[PDB]
């Protein structure tokens, strides 16, 4: 297509509208109601341009560029006089009722309405009458509501309802009294409600957790990082001020998590600011905890380790690839253990083997939205991999997109698409132990134990391909529903099979692999997705090592006297009594961690590791994508006594002091080169980010905006002398504003979006090749493995049907977005949001045991009687008991385990 804007000629896409085409060309058109992910509706009337019929047309006509297709030979004018006056008048009409609130507004300096008011040139008020006002609502602990600042752009309701599928937000009232909010006071129920603080162009919806410790955007120190709260690997921009983590902003990645986070990643950063975090190396002596600096801690640990006969290491999926590799080099490959349980490790390696040996392509998170049928087996994705659930919702709405495309309706005209596709949707079949949050759009939901879900998967695979093993004992109703699933999956152009390790069953993963193989054998374009548990679960699986049970056995027999535990609390993956006994028997326990854990009471040495905000490293995605996260701030900049080093720095210095009796800390690129040298499967982490010598025309990449304030006052209460700027030898970023953050800079890692005239999250438009697409020079992060040429064989181990045994209760896992993750549940803002720990009972089982709802029952697991109140679960199959994994006292390793002596307290 060819368009002529203001006399200049441009080549654009004809399938795009004029607003997105002109924004992709660098032209500035003000807009409110349009969003790249939400489509065009024509509400705010801000994007007005003057369209002419041909080249010899002088009158023209004002049209909305978001509602006008960028067809071939289209003549428009942005800088036309009448269009400029109309856009200024739209800004003025919005300004008539807007409150005098900018100094006490959390959106100030980050506000799209401020930027568009300045951009249109409106600065003079001639409206003299009263402004309408509104009462606010309580929206829960995360989102603060200020209804006075609304411009009625309908972005919130469109995102929350049409995109995110939420039900408790809406627009109420009439003409100029339109109210956007909930029908009553209460917490927003959506798992993706936190994206409202960037979707809303004004300060109506603000980050309440940030509002507690508010600072402006220009005062922030940003870094490009990876969210640590599950395996999905969403790109984030942590922003700090005065030595504490203050906000998590969405960092655009056109391949992974483009505009949207989930609420866990956005609001579960509060564990970084906990005051009980270790900040110095601490050595115990008798009952005295003496504080050491880094050098003498390294020397004492090196001599004590050298006096030992065998040192073993226990890694964690919390830690990065570099930290786990440094531990593996410190103790040796034969003495390195992964730190997760044996069954968890087996499920993780099975998922990994399906990913890089199953011969079936695994899609990225953005690519999930293009699949025409989804089968989810055992993985409650909303509570474990929430952004995958959001992408599955988009893939489900793909059917309405298809029927609209058949009627020659443009893909950005979202209201017409939704009107054509009323309730027709792509097939979604979710299986779980109970009801999921995806059941509102699912074509079918299967509530059954994990062996029954695996049997359903194997039956689907056998009905798709007769070479797959069959399942004996299928009821005709279940057989008919299996036939419905098979007819839906066979007729799909792009079927997608999603599973994961959170179900706690190996056979569910095997059944999902068999379904994917059966769909691959029919020539379909089948994709497979595996949801891991933690941020670097797949990297720990790729690196490998022994299980936690083997390390505990080595400590308990006495073959190992020294144990180094890296970023692992050890109670989520093993029984607490066994861990306590093994660590009390061990004469030397060293714990390298950034959070106060229960195993630090028995620790001889505690090394204060850095969290993700204070460390660099690489983490491996659930789809096998290596992604580098960068340090946000120096923890020793304000508190000079703080010795909080990177975990790989601690372990490399420990290995150097053990070998040559001298301290060499490290550089990060040296550890990365060591990883790609000793481990060839992790050789792709070299290309995840450029090294520390990378420059943009000779200068580093800036971590803070150019108007960063208080450079001679922020530390003045400690010392009037300004300290040295912290040096970053690890990465290409500088801990200052003396750097580059140009949107045209040839790089992939962007710490924050800012452009002149665009101070809001709409500044991400300038950093993309086309708006809503990819980053201009490619998205960061590379895939570790490609699709294998040949797949796996059919798994013939079909599990038997679930049989309830008397006195034994099979534990059905119930994951929660707020609580099941360890670090996020340590955050103080998650304590109010997470619920009380209930235990789920079938009505028949509760009636047999004589307990109603809310009554406390006590059960013994591993010789430990704990009591929980009973919640009646209708969908849970009898013979099962429901437990919330990841909570305090209920380890995620309990999923799939049995349970004895369920007695009323």
């Amino acid at each position: 297509a060819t368009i002529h804007v203001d006399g200049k000629e441009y080549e654009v896409n004809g399938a795009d509208n004029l607003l997105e085409a002109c924004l992709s060309l660098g032209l500035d058109i003000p807009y409110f109601c349009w969003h790249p992910a939400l489509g065009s509706v024509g509400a705010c009337r801000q994007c007005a341009v003057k369209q002419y019929q041909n080249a010899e047309d002088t009158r023209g006509r004002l049209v909305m560029s978001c509602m006008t297709p960028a067809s071939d030979g289209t003549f428009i004018s942005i800088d036309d006089e009448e269009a400029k006056q109309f856009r200024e008048s739209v800004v003025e009409w919005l300004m008539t009722n807007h409150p005098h609130d900018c100094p006490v507004c959390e959106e100030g300096g980050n506000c799209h309405l401020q930027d568009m008011t300045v951009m249109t040139g409106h600065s003079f008020r001639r409206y003299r009458f009263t402004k309408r006002t509104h009462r606010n609502q309580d929206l829960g602990p995360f989102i603060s509501h200020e209804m006075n600042r609304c411009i009625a752009c309908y972005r919130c309701v469109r995102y929350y309802k049409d995109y995110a599928g939420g039900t408790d937000l809406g627009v109420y009232g009439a003409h100029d009294n339109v109210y956007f909010g909930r029908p009553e006071d209460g917490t927003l129920e959506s798992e993706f409600s936190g994206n409202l603080v960037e979707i809303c162009p004004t300060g109506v919806f603000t980050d309440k957790t940030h509002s507690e410790r508010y600072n402006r955007k220009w005062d922030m120190q940003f870094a490009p990082s990876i969210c640590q709260q599950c395996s999905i690997g969403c790109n984030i921009s942590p922003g700090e001020r005065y030595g504490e983590l203050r906000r998590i902003e969405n960092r655009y990645n056109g391949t992974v998590n483009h505009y949207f986070l989930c609420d866990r990643g956005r609001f579960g950063y509060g564990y970084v600011n906990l005051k009980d975090r270790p900040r110095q190396p601490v050595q115990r002596r008798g009952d005295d905890f003496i504080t050491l600096n880094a050098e003498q801690a390294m020397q004492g640990a090196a001599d004590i380790l050298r006096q030992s006969k065998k040192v073993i290491g226990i890694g964690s999926p919390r830690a990065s690839v570099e930290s786990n590799f440094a531990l593996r080099e410190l103790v040796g490959e034969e003495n390195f253990y992964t730190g997760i349980a044996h069954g968890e490790q087996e499920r993780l390696q099975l998922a990994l083997k399906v990913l890089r040996e199953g011969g079936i392509y695994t899609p990225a998170l953005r690519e999930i939205e293009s699949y025409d049928a989804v089968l989810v087996l055992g993985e409650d994705v909303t509570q474990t991999g929430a952004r995958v659930a959001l992408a599955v919702r988009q893939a489900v709405k793909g059917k309405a997109r298809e029927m609209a495309a058949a009627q020659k309706v443009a893909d950005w005209q979202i209201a017409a698409i939704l009107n054509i596709g009323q309730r027709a949707k792509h097939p979604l079949f979710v299986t779980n132990v109970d009801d999921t949050r995806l059941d509102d759009i699912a074509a079918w939901t299967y509530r059954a134990p994990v062996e029954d879900q695996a049997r359903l998967g194997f039956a689907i695979a056998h009905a798709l391909d007769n070479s797959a093993p069959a399942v004996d004992g299928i009821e005709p109703e279940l057989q008919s529903k299996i036939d419905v699933i098979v007819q839906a999956l066979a007729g799909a152009k792009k079927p997608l099979i999603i599973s994961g390790t959170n179900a706690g069953s190996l056979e569910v993963i095997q059944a999902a692999a068999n379904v994917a193989k059966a769909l691959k054998g029919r020539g379909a374009d089948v994709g497979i997705t595996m949801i891991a548990r933690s941020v670097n679960s797949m990297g720990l699986g790729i690196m490998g090592g022994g299980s936690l049970e083997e390390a505990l056995t080595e400590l308990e027999t006495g073959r190992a006297d020294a144990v180094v535990v890296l970023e692992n609390d050890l109670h989520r993956h093993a029984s607490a009594t066994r861990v306590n006994a093994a660590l009390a028997k061990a004469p030397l326990v060293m714990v390298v961690d950034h959070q106060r854990t229960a195993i630090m009471e028995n620790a001889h040495l505690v090394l204060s590791a850095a969290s993700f905000a204070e460390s660099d490293g690489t983490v491996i995605n659930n789809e096998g994508r290596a992604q580098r996260f960068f340090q946000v701030y120096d923890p020793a900049y304000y508190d000079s006594k703080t010795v909080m080093l990177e975990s790989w720095r601690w372990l490399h210095s420990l290995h150097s002091t053990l070998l040559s009796r001298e301290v060499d800390w490290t550089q990060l690129d040296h550890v990365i080169d060591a990883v790609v040298a000793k481990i060839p499967e992790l050789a792709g982490i070299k290309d995840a980010a450029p090294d520390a010598t990378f420059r943009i025309r000779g200068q580093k990449l800036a971590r803070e905006p150019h108007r960063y304030s208080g450079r001679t006052a922020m530390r003045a209460n400690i010392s009037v002398h300004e300290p040295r700027q912290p040096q970053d030898i690890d990465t290409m970023f500088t801990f200052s504003m003396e750097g580059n953050n140009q949107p045209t800079a040839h790089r992939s890692q962007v710490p924050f979006a800012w452009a002149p005239g665009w101070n809001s999250p709409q500044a991400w438009n300038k950093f993309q090749d086309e708006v809503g697409g990819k980053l201009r020079f490619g998205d960061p992060g590379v895939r570790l493995f490609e699709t294998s040429e040949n797949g796996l064989d059919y798994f013939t181990s079909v599990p038997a049907r679930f049989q309830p045994q008397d006195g034994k209760w099979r534990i059905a896992p119930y994951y929660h977005l707020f609580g099941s993750d360890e670090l996020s549940q340590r955050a103080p803002v998650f304590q109010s949001r997470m619920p009380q720990p209930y235990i789920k009972l079938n009505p028949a089982d509760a009636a047999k045991l004589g307990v109603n709802a809310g009554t406390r029952v006590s059960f013994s697991y591993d010789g430990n009687t704990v009591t929980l109140p009973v919640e009646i679960a209708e969908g849970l199959t009898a013979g099962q008991v429901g437990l919330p994994m990841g909570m305090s006292g209920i380890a995620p390793v309990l999923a799939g385990a049995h349970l004895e002596d369920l007695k009323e307290a």
Binding site: V41, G42, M67, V171, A174, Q407, V409, Q413, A415, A416, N419, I420, G421, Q422
Partner: protein, 147 residues
């Protein structure tokens, strides 16, 4: 009555055409009279209008082809199909065919409504049919077709 007489429902007049007629009572908003907002309010939603294209003829009520017509247009239809097209063209020598309900309201002598052919003078309606203005009142303005 029409359903009892076989003029509505299943197999109307033995043709095989099935048609049922419902009456949806409104809830008091003026914007509901706009045709796309009418379609939105018929679907049980807030009566916001829709952007055209697409027109309701291709995707209207519940995404189906839909035609919205005024009461008086549908009342003009049966006379056209019972008396002929040429009769409808041969009742007024104007560019707008057929008759139209025209009236005058306000402080006139006889406010009301009369069926008149197109091309009727507004002064003719005001004086002959409405009776002119009331006693002691002088005409100063008029609105031809509503608010």
């Amino acid at each position: 009555e029409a359903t009892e007489a076989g003029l509505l429902g299943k197999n109307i007049m033995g043709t095989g055409f099935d048609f049922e007629l419902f009456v949806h009572t409104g809830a008091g908003r003026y914007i509901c009279g706009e045709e796309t907002a009418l379609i939105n309010s018929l679907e049980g939603r807030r009566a916001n209008p829709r952007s055209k294209p697409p027109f309701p003829a291709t995707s209207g009520a519940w995404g189906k082809p839909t035609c919205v017509n005024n009461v008086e247009t549908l009342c003009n239809v049966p006379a056209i199909l019972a008396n002929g097209v040429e009769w409808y063209q041969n009742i007024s020598k104007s560019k707008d065919a057929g008759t139209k309900l025209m009236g005058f309201s306000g402080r006139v002598k006889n406010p009301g409504l009369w069926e008149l052919p197109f091309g009727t003078t507004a002064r003719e309606i005001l004086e002959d049919y409405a009776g002119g203005m009331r006693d002691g009142l002088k005409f100063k303005a008029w609105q031809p077709g509503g608010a």
